[PDB]
């Protein structure tokens, strides 16, 4: 074990100084050494390597190492038992195994092994003394830094220690160092200004070719999908630097790119991916505005994917939606966002009428997603926008045509009719101020559902009045089942009395 562990640093330094052949061989054939120089470039000597951010892969690596260690323990015990039988005729056990702490499996190219803490300490000492990370930064070929790039925390120290690596021919590295940048400080500022001019030429300038522009933009796009908010902030900051007043770079400058159409599909795809994980309401609003103004509607698949993604945003991120549409502060930006969403969904509905199979009372047929249906329902409950109401009324009539049956729904797989209106959505419609939606929700409500809805708060006054009327009707129809469902008569009676100043059913409860 001692020799096996002490062999690694020598090979590591040899590879660091001859990365063309020995370094590549270690990088490819020997996983143990392959992570070792990664440790030094990242300056983070953590097993599993900080480069691999995937939790399940980390756990898989841990379990593989544990299994290999257990198998090695068993094999060492068996071999030492053989040796003891041959020489000393002694039984070898866990506490009586001398070779257990002295020998290790000689499988350098096999499953990775845990570096000893002292091994890691001497690796870090060697790296600090010999600026080994900076050696590979000088080494253009093979620059495994870009391979790893294909992360900001370990990039910080590496870049700061590698001053001569500020440019590094690859444009991906140029953008990476620009984001990193986002006497010595003055020199860094001047160099960053020069790099900004170079990238401005590479994107807006005559030399701006599709390949380099796509690389530059896609780097920021992919890093905007990082769960860490810091990475997304850096990416957006760099994009704005190269290019809702604060998002005008995306809203106004980005459309002005010479290859804007060339990169528009990729940008829309990246924004669609990032919306599912974004947190800032204003950034989400900017994403929505840009998608509404620039999403390619030509592709049926693209249109369906955008609609489904926006539906996921509406449903799964109801908290962010509430932040955006806070009734306290109805803003022009919020109204514009609502208008953009309504226009997007109206266009999608037009395409569908021109997963669940939906048939309209008019006879139109199309298979959309119930989540998207609920998304239109939620937007309708949000109320008409202050600027435009044509789209709002059109969608309202399409989904809830006046004095007409609602569009029938069926399961795509089984053709069985499905509940287009879940109980929670019906409750939200009840809370909404739209009379048509309120009536649609009120239609076909069980006594238990009525009780649960009454239990909710924030509902409009006329809505509680209608709920009281419906509960009185239910009492008239079948008071026995309603009373059976009633748990605390006094509780519901007090709630009803509260609603009164906020009748027959109240009398029933009192009975």
């Amino acid at each position: 074990s001692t020799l096996y562990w002490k062999a690694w640093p020598l090979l590591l330094v040899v590879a660091a100084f001859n990365p063309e052949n020995i370094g590549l061989a270690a990088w490819e054939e020997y996983p143990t050494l392959k992570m070792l120089m990664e440790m030094v470039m990242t300056n983070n000597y953590s097993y599993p390597p900080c480069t691999l951010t995937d939790e399940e892969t980390r756990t898989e690596m841990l379990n593989r190492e544990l299994q290999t260690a257990q198998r090695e323990k068993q094999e060492i015990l068996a071999f030492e038992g053989h040796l003891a039988a041959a020489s000393t005729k002694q039984t070898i056990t866990e506490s009586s195994s001398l070779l257990l702490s002295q020998l290790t499996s000689l499988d350098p190219q096999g499953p990775p092994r845990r570096p000893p803490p002292h091994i890691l300490d001497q690796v870090k000492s060697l790296n600090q003394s010999l600026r080994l990370g900076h050696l590979l930064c000088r080494s253009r070929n093979p620059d495994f830094l870009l391979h790893i790039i294909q992360s900001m925390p370990w990039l910080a120290d590496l870049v700061q220690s590698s001053e001569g690596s500020l440019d590094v021919l690859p444009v991906q590295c140029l953008c990476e160092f620009l984001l990193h940048d986002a006497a010595k400080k003055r020199q860094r500022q001047q160099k960053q200004r020069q790099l900004l001019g170079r990238l401005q030429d590479l994107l807006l300038g005559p030399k701006a070719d599709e390949q380099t522009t796509c690389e530059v933009l896609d780097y920021f796009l992919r890093r905007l999908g990082s769960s860490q908010v810091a990475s997304r902030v850096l990416a957006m900051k760099g994009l704005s630097l190269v290019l809702l007043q604060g998002y005008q770079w995306l809203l106004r400058d980005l459309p002005r790119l010479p290859l804007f159409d060339s990169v528009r599909s990729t940008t829309a795809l990246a924004l669609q991916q990032a919306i599912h994980m974004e947190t800032d309401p204003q950034t989400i609003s900017a994403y929505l505005i840009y998608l509404s103004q620039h999403t390619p509607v030509e592709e049926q698949a693209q249109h369906s994917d955008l609609a489904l993604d926006v539906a996921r945003l509406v449903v799964e991120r109801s908290t962010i939606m509430s932040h955006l549409f806070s009734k306290l502060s109805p803003s022009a930006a919020s109204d514009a966002v609502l208008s953009a969403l309504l226009s997007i969904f109206s266009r999608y509905v037009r395409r569908m009428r021109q997963q669940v199979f939906l048939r309209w009372s008019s006879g139109e047929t199309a298979t959309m997603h119930i989540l998207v249906v609920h998304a239109m329902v939620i937007l309708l409950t949000l109320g008409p926008p202050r600027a435009d109401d044509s789209e709002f009324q059109a969608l309202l009539d399409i989904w809830f045509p006046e004095e007409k049956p609602l569009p029938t729904a069926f399961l795509v797989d089984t053709s069985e009719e499905a509940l287009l209106l879940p109980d929670w959505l019906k409750l939200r419609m009840i809370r909404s101020e739209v009379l048509r939606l309120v009536d649609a929700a009120l239609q076909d409500l069980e006594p238990q559902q009525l009780l649960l809805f009454v239990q909710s708060f924030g509902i409009p006054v006329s809505s509680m009045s209608k709920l009281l009327q419906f509960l009185d009707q239910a009492v008239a129809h079948d008071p026995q089942t309603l009373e059976q469902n009633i748990m605390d008569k006094n509780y519901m009676a007090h709630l009803v009395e509260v609603q009164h100043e906020r009748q027959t059913f109240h009398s029933l409860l009192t009975a």
Partner: protein
């Protein structure tokens, strides 16, 4: 940010239901958990005056969507969570999504488990800090939204 108004705090201390009505909406939004717990939990004191106070609390309760969410939070059983937390604490003594995203997407009991684990980890860190002040970062607690 907005802190609890001193008037709101003194009203809560004096259990002045009438002043609770005078309190503005954001103060109520901040104070919801105690208020809803008061209105829903079985009353320790069963006086008629307290019953009328409860009626006033109910009068004030309307206008909040988070009431339903808090009711769901309370719905979760707590004995199982407590025993799980005790076992996890003993172990400590011996997710692809960010924590904020997990808190959002996951349901109420998952939110409880996550936050409880985080707070107990912070508690253990403080206990072992030996009086040395440090900082701990959690996107959940650093998320303004």
């Amino acid at each position: 940010l907005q802190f609890v108004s001193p008037f709101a705090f003194e009203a809560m201390q004096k259990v002045d239901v009438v002043c609770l009505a005078s309190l503005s909406d954001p103060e109520l939004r901040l104070l919801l958990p105690c208020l809803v717990r008061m209105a829903l939990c079985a009353p320790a004191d069963q006086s008629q005056s307290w019953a009328q106070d409860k009626k006033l609390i109910l009068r004030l309760l309307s206008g909040v969507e988070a009431v339903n969410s808090i009711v769901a939070l309370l719905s979760v059983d707590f004995h199982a969570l407590e025993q799980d937390a005790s076992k996890e604490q003993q172990l400590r003594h011996k997710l692809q999504h960010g924590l904020t995203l997990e808190f959002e997407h996951s349901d109420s009991p998952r939110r409880l488990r996550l936050v409880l684990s985080e707070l107990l980890a912070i508690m253990n860190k403080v206990s072992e800090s030996n009086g040395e002040f440090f900082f701990k970062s959690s996107e959940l607690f650093e998320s303004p939204v």
